[PDB]
């Protein structure tokens, strides 16, 4: 994927 939500 491109873009990781769980990191923010």
């Amino acid at each position, epitope marked *: *994927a*491109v*873009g*990781i*939500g*769980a*990191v*923010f």
Partner: antibody
Amino acid sequence: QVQLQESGPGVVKPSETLSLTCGVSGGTISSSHFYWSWIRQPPGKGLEWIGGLYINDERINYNPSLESRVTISKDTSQNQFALKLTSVTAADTAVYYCVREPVIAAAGTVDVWGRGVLVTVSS
Amino acid sequence: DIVMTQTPLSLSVTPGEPASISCRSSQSLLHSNGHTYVHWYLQKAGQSPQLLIYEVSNRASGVPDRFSGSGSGTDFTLKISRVEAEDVGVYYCEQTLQIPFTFGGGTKVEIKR
């Protein structure tokens, strides 16, 4: 530029430990804004996310369904991303992928997947 | 865990007509930072998954204009304006909003004859 080169034994005996390596060709594992993941695919059954780590904060996340048995590490010494899985059963027979994901679009507009390595659990 | 539900299980397309695959989440994929963290891949036979679309609608850097993504919230759609022979395989949706990341069950796309 960057290619992920996977390797590991194809056969692991039941109750033993599976170990896979993901070499980083064309870059270093310590680059900022990347998430590193292990995903597996049983023969003909779809994709399961195992775990990953975020470089900027070195937070490591595990899939709770495996969290007891899995160890994921970054290996700066060998420019490698590593997976270790204990007490394997036939249920762990699968194709294993490492993937590098830009956590932000500025870091990249595509991810990178390794070719995938088949691991068979059998005696 | 967020469940991703893909429909249909299988689709048959004659080359050149559009195809449309559906993915629906058990909860919203919108983060408070304003991004929606859902993605589309194609995995061809004996090959590793290939990222087609990230964050609902964006095209990964080597993907033709023929692939497009739409939706919001909980409902997402991948559209292939014209299916070509090279587009056969299994398409997956994935969420990266919360741990663990979860994939849909996959949609097998084959050629009708």
